[PDB]
Design an enzyme around this catalytic site. Structure first.
Site, PDB file in Angstrom:
ATOM      1  N   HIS D 200       0.765  -1.236   0.000  1.00 42.84           N
ATOM      2  CA  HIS D 200       0.000   0.000   0.000  1.00 42.84           C
ATOM      3  C   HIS D 200       0.797   1.289   0.000  1.00 42.84           C
ATOM      4  O   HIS D 200       0.245   2.349  -0.312  1.00 42.84           O
ATOM      5  CB  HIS D 200      -1.136  -0.010   1.030  1.00 42.84           C
ATOM      6  N   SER D 204      -0.540  -0.474  -6.612  1.00 44.98           N
ATOM      7  CA  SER D 204      -0.233  -1.566  -7.507  1.00 44.98           C
ATOM      8  C   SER D 204       0.610  -1.131  -8.731  1.00 44.98           C
ATOM      9  O   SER D 204       0.575   0.038  -9.122  1.00 44.98           O
ATOM     10  CB  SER D 204      -1.543  -2.207  -7.990  1.00 44.98           C
ATOM     11  N   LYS D 226     -14.514  -6.882  -9.909  1.00 41.85           N
ATOM     12  CA  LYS D 226     -13.602  -7.686 -10.716  1.00 41.85           C
ATOM     13  C   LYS D 226     -12.981  -8.764  -9.799  1.00 41.85           C
ATOM     14  O   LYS D 226     -12.699  -9.868 -10.255  1.00 41.85           O
ATOM     15  CB  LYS D 226     -12.544  -6.826 -11.432  1.00 41.85           C
ATOM     16  N   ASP D 227     -12.876  -8.485  -8.494  1.00 42.71           N
ATOM     17  CA  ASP D 227     -12.358  -9.476  -7.530  1.00 42.71           C
ATOM     18  C   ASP D 227     -13.424 -10.535  -7.163  1.00 42.71           C
ATOM     19  O   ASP D 227     -13.102 -11.698  -6.869  1.00 42.71           O
ATOM     20  CB  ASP D 227     -11.876  -8.801  -6.255  1.00 42.71           C
ATOM     21  N   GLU D 270       4.287 -34.083  -3.607  1.00 43.64           N
ATOM     22  CA  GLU D 270       3.068 -33.559  -4.236  1.00 43.64           C
ATOM     23  C   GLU D 270       3.407 -32.734  -5.497  1.00 43.64           C
ATOM     24  O   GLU D 270       4.481 -32.114  -5.574  1.00 43.64           O
ATOM     25  CB  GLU D 270       2.285 -32.722  -3.244  1.00 43.64           C
TER      26      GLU D 270
HETATM   27  C1  HEM Z   1       0.529 -15.824   1.107  1.00 45.67           C
HETATM   28  C2  HEM Z   1       0.412 -15.710  -0.412  1.00 45.67           C
HETATM   29  C3  HEM Z   1       0.285 -14.286  -0.898  1.00 45.67           C
HETATM   30  C4  HEM Z   1      -0.740 -13.469  -0.685  1.00 45.67           C
HETATM   31  C5  HEM Z   1      -1.984 -13.752   0.126  1.00 45.67           C
HETATM   32  C6  HEM Z   1      -0.494 -12.325  -1.298  1.00 45.67           C
HETATM   33  C7  HEM Z   1      -1.482 -11.240  -1.272  1.00 45.67           C
HETATM   34  C8  HEM Z   1      -1.262 -10.216  -2.337  1.00 45.67           C
HETATM   35  C9  HEM Z   1      -2.336  -9.252  -2.626  1.00 45.67           C
HETATM   36  C10 HEM Z   1      -3.701  -9.217  -2.000  1.00 45.67           C
HETATM   37  C11 HEM Z   1      -1.822  -8.366  -3.664  1.00 45.67           C
HETATM   38  C12 HEM Z   1      -2.645  -7.255  -4.248  1.00 45.67           C
HETATM   39  C13 HEM Z   1      -2.352  -6.895  -5.703  1.00 45.67           C
HETATM   40  C14 HEM Z   1      -2.210  -8.064  -6.652  1.00 45.67           C
HETATM   41  O1  HEM Z   1      -2.600  -9.169  -6.372  1.00 45.67           O
HETATM   42  O2  HEM Z   1      -1.634  -7.901  -7.703  1.00 45.67           O
HETATM   43  C15 HEM Z   1      -0.435  -8.835  -3.924  1.00 45.67           C
HETATM   44  C16 HEM Z   1       0.460  -8.185  -4.924  1.00 45.67           C
HETATM   45  C17 HEM Z   1       1.907  -8.560  -4.900  1.00 45.67           C
HETATM   46  N1  HEM Z   1       2.483  -9.671  -4.247  1.00 45.67           N
HETATM   47 FE1  HEM Z   1       1.606 -11.023  -3.121  1.00 45.67          FE
HETATM   48  N2  HEM Z   1       0.714 -12.401  -2.028  1.00 45.67           N
HETATM   49  C18 HEM Z   1       1.182 -13.677  -1.665  1.00 45.67           C
HETATM   50  C19 HEM Z   1       2.414 -14.355  -2.115  1.00 45.67           C
HETATM   51  C20 HEM Z   1       3.342 -13.453  -2.858  1.00 45.67           C
HETATM   52  C21 HEM Z   1       4.447 -13.935  -3.407  1.00 45.67           C
HETATM   53  C22 HEM Z   1       4.801 -15.414  -3.359  1.00 45.67           C
HETATM   54  C23 HEM Z   1       5.125 -12.922  -3.955  1.00 45.67           C
HETATM   55  C24 HEM Z   1       6.419 -12.976  -4.744  1.00 45.67           C
HETATM   56  C25 HEM Z   1       7.550 -13.666  -4.004  1.00 45.67           C
HETATM   57  C26 HEM Z   1       4.428 -11.809  -3.782  1.00 45.67           C
HETATM   58  C27 HEM Z   1       4.954 -10.477  -4.202  1.00 45.67           C
HETATM   59  C28 HEM Z   1       3.840  -9.564  -4.585  1.00 45.67           C
HETATM   60  C29 HEM Z   1       4.037  -8.461  -5.296  1.00 45.67           C
HETATM   61  C30 HEM Z   1       5.409  -8.019  -5.770  1.00 45.67           C
HETATM   62  C31 HEM Z   1       2.871  -7.839  -5.500  1.00 45.67           C
HETATM   63  C32 HEM Z   1       2.678  -6.528  -6.269  1.00 45.67           C
HETATM   64  C33 HEM Z   1       1.924  -6.827  -7.560  1.00 45.67           C
HETATM   65  C34 HEM Z   1       1.747  -5.680  -8.527  1.00 45.67           C
HETATM   66  O3  HEM Z   1       1.347  -4.597  -8.126  1.00 45.67           O
HETATM   67  O4  HEM Z   1       1.916  -5.869  -9.726  1.00 45.67           O
HETATM   68  N3  HEM Z   1       3.289 -12.046  -2.975  1.00 45.67           N
HETATM   69  N4  HEM Z   1      -0.215  -9.913  -3.129  1.00 45.67           N
END
Ligand code: HEM
Ligand code: HEM
Ligand code: FES
Lengths: 49, 51, 105, 378, 75, 60
Positions: D200, D204, D226-227, D270
């Site tokens: 935040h 994004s 959209k979500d 798995e």
């Molecule tokens: C526990 C699993 C995860 C949850 C619940 C989670 C939750 C979220 C949420 C709600 C967003 C909001 C915007 C979007 O989806 O694009 C987001 C974006 C992002 N997440 Fe995760 N995420 C998780 C795992 C990851 C992983 C594995 C990575 C990479 C190692 C990651 C890196 C990012 C990044 C860099 C964004 C920014 C996306 C953008 O604005 O293009 N997160 N995530």
């Protein structure tokens, strides 16, 4: 038992090939299978431990 | 592109923090050693031979 | 000058068309990733360019939204592509490196 | 004035999913964040109900699980939603990490690293999860994997016995895993909140990789709906599996109660680990394989320092688009290999895909970037 | 941070918009819809498809070589 | 000798959070042991209900 290129043992997990003496010949395993401490108490008996 | 940190000043800076970084390693050494009761290391220390 | 330059130039014109931002009416410098040097240069742009730059980017984001593209006629022709931002950025980098040299002494 | 804006609680909600400025731009690849969130509560919700019945002792481990599906009312959908939810969780996880790499979202250092921690965490969580029903694969998959740490010099032995609670995968080893598999998803959730906190700060990223401050839209009603739609799709996928092909992604071998002397010939983890399993055995070394397997996931943290292009997204870079999909395809090869016995073609092709994975990330993508810059006169 | 009103500076751009209760939710859904998708596919096949068929070929071959390596004729 | 004690202790070991830490860790080592001696020795003196039982039942 009786699997692998060496007519001894084969461990399917990452491809360990052992011979009939228990020695490592192929695959990633670092050492030979362990020989436990043992002795023969007679012609029919073996005591391991 | 770590060339930005390469010059006289930076070299003086590194020397200035050497005693500190050394002492901080002394703390981490003894620290692990004492916390795991390092059999290997501790045997050399007089009075800490509880065997 | 000869066949050689034209070949590199045409290899470049080919990638350009393949990169495909011109399809969104964008310009090379519009796609530049914003970092500190870039933020400052964007800041130094004069009123007109800065305004045009924002509208261009808005036109694109808007397209990229509905995943449409501009009519072929209105794509931005290589050649015709103005590196408006370049001189500013170069000077911003050139300034920073001076501080960086000064910081070594 | 307006309550939604100033109440100490709602502020959060409001600034997190109501008024939050969002790009008009973001596409379907952006839905995975919310789906990961949904996967999380789902695993928590069904997972809980499963724990109100499952008992964690070898004697009844398998039994209780069977008790669940036959006697416990609807314990079967619950059980299957759980199992399949884990897979859905991994699909979205991999999709999410995919979007990030393609679009340069990783430029957000902290958000991304929290994500790597989210990855290892949900991964570590699921490894333990599957040991629970005490099936052949559970015990054995639990044995193969745990032991890996036995390669760490001077300490692997002591360590492996320490997390074992004995000299083998015993009773100690099952209750342990139940406990951790219960507490890990709570910590996951808190860490996911920090993921969002850090995210935040910037808002994004978007498909073009160009800043969108110039065209931001409120999260509600656009991305709430959209979500919503994209969650329904995740429900379709999930339900299609549990209500039609419940065992499709599962081994039949785990339906046979564990046996410490048995040892199946088949032996694989798995599906969601196959690529990493491949990478591991492709090395004829105890330390090597493990070190390489570690480097296989921990490399997600090297990515930002390997960024080389003057553009953030890959949308306008074709050399990289090609390299990207080669990377995807190469993981698909790794998945395939890991699911096959360590024999004939498979060995060497498995060793090729391995070197490739690393060449593609550690050298080919960074280089393509420099070339694409050069081609633009940048 | 964040918040509308403090994002960035923009001037001279007008935006005409229409109430959703005044327009249709699917204007020319197939009419303009399909052409677009073809276009998008075309735009990306050469970058997406090639690695996948490369895997496919290595998949079917690798499979055949496996099966056919486990039989013997003379010797 | 007395003021200079706390003084020297500050001089050579207390300013630098380094030494300050180096000493407490090193000081924790000696202390942990010397405390466990005296403490156990105390537990024994008030008891003697086990251990000297050994001198009797075995020794073979
Ligand atoms: C526990 C699993 C995860 C949850 C619940 C989670 C939750 C979220 C949420 C709600 C967003 C909001 C915007 C979007 O989806 O694009 C987001 C974006 C992002 N997440 Fe995760 N995420 C998780 C795992 C990851 C992983 C594995 C990575 C990479 C190692 C990651 C890196 C990012 C990044 C860099 C964004 C920014 C996306 C953008 O604005 O293009 N997160 N995530
Ligand atoms: C804290 C909420 C969770 C609880 C209470 C929970 C508890 C359980 C219990 C008791 C089992 C054994 C019963 C059975 O197999 O049906 C199980 C299986 C499993 N759950 Fe969880 N778990 C939770 C969160 C998770 C999470 C976060 C994941 C990762 C997506 C996960 C994936 C698994 C897996 C892989 C299995 C074993 C495979 C199978 O269903 O047969 N669960 N869980
Ligand atoms: S555990 Fe035997 S080859 Fe890996």
């Amino acid at each position: 038992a009786n699997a692998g290129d060496f007519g001894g043992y084969y461990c399917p997990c990452h491809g360990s090939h052992y011979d009939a003496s228990g020695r490592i010949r192929k695959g990633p395993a670092p050492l030979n299978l362990e020989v436990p401490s043992y002795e023969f108490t007679s012609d029919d008996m073996v005591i391991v431990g | 592109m770590l060339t930005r940190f390469l010059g006289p000043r930076y070299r003086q800076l590194a020397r200035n923090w050497v005693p500190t970084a050394q002492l901080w390693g002394a703390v981490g050494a003894v620290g692990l050693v004492w916390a795991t009761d390092w059999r290997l290391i501790l045997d050399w220390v007089p009075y800490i031979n509880g065997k | 000058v000869s066949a050689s330059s034209r070949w590199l130039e045409g290899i470049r014109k080919w990638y350009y068309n393949a990169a495909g931002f011109n399809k969104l009416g964008l310009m090379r410098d519009d796609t530049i990733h914003e970092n500190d040097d870039v933020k400052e240069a964007i800041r130094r742009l004069p009123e007109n360019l800065y305004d045009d730059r924002v509208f261009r980017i808005k036109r694109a984001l808007d397209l990229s939204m509905r995943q449409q593209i501009l009519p072929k006629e209105q794509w931005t022709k290589y050649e015709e592509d103005k590196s408006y931002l370049e001189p500013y950025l170069k000077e911003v980098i050139r300034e920073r490196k001076e501080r960086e040299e000064w910081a070594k002494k | 004035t307006n309550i939604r804006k100033s109440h100490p609680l709602m502020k959060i909600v409001n600034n997190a999913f109501i008024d939050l400025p969002a790009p008009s731009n973001i596409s379907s690849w952006w839905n995975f964040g919310s789906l990961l969130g949904i996967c999380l509560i789902l695993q928590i919700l069904t997972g809980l109900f499963l724990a109100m019945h499952y008992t964690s002792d070898t004697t009844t481990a398998f039994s209780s699980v069977t008790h669940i599906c036959r006697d416990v009312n609807y314990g079967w959908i619950i059980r299957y939603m759980h199992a399949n939810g884990a897979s859905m969780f991994f699909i979205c996880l991999y999709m999410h990490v995919g979007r990030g790499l393609y679009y340069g979202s990783y430029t957000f250092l902290e958000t991304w690293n929290i994500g790597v921690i989210l990855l290892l965490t949900v991964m570590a969580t699921a490894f333990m999860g599957y040991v629970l029903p005490w099936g052949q694969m559970s015990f054995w998959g639990a044995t193969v994997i745990t032991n890996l740490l036995s390669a760490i010099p001077y300490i692997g032995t002591n360590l492996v016995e320490w997390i074992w609670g004995g000299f083998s995968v015993d009773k100690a080893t099952l209750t342990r895993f139940f406990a951790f598999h219960f507490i890990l998803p709570f910590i996951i959730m808190a860490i996911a909140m920090v993921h969002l906190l850090f995210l935040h700060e910037t808002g994004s990223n978007n498909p073009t990789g160009i800043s969108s401050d110039v065209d931001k839209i409120p999260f509600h009603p656009y991305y709430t709906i959209k979500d919503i739609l994209g969650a329904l799709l995740l429900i379709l996928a999930l339900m299609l599996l549990v209500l039609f092909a419940p065992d499709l992604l599962g081994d039949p071998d785990n339906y046979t109660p564990a046996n410490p002397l048995n040892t199946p010939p088949h032996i694989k983890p798995e599906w969601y680990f196959l690529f990493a399993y491949a990478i591991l055995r492709s090395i004829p070394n105890k330390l090597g394989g493990v070190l390489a397997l570690a480097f296989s996931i921990l490399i997600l943290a090297l990515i930002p320092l390997l960024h080389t292009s003057k553009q953030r997204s890959m949308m306008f870079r074709p050399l990289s688009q090609c390299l990207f999909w080669a990377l995807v395809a190469d993981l698909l090869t790794l998945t395939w290999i890991g699911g096959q016995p360590v024999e004939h073609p498979y060995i060497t092709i498995g060793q090729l895909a391995s070197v490739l994975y690393f060449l593609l990330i550690l050298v080919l993508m960074p280089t393509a970037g420099t070339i694409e810059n050069k081609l633009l006169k940048w | 941070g964040r918040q509308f009103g403090h994002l960035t500076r923009v001037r001279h751009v007008i935006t005409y918009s229409l109430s959703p209760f005044e327009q249709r939710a699917f204007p020319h859904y197939f009419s303009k819809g399909i052409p677009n998708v073809l276009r998008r596919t075309r735009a990306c096949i050469l970058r997406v498809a090639p690695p996948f068929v490369a895997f496919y070929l290595v998949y079917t071959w690798g499979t055949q070589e496996f099966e056919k390596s486990k039989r013997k004729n003379p010797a | 000798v007395a003021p200079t004690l706390t003084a020297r202790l500050y001089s050579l070991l207390f300013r630098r959070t380094s030494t300050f830490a180096l000493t407490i860790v090193v000081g924790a080592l000696f202390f942990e042991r010397a405390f466990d001696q005296g403490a156990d020795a105390i537990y024994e003196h008030i008891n003697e209900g086990k251990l000297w039982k050994h001198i009797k039942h075995k020794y073979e």
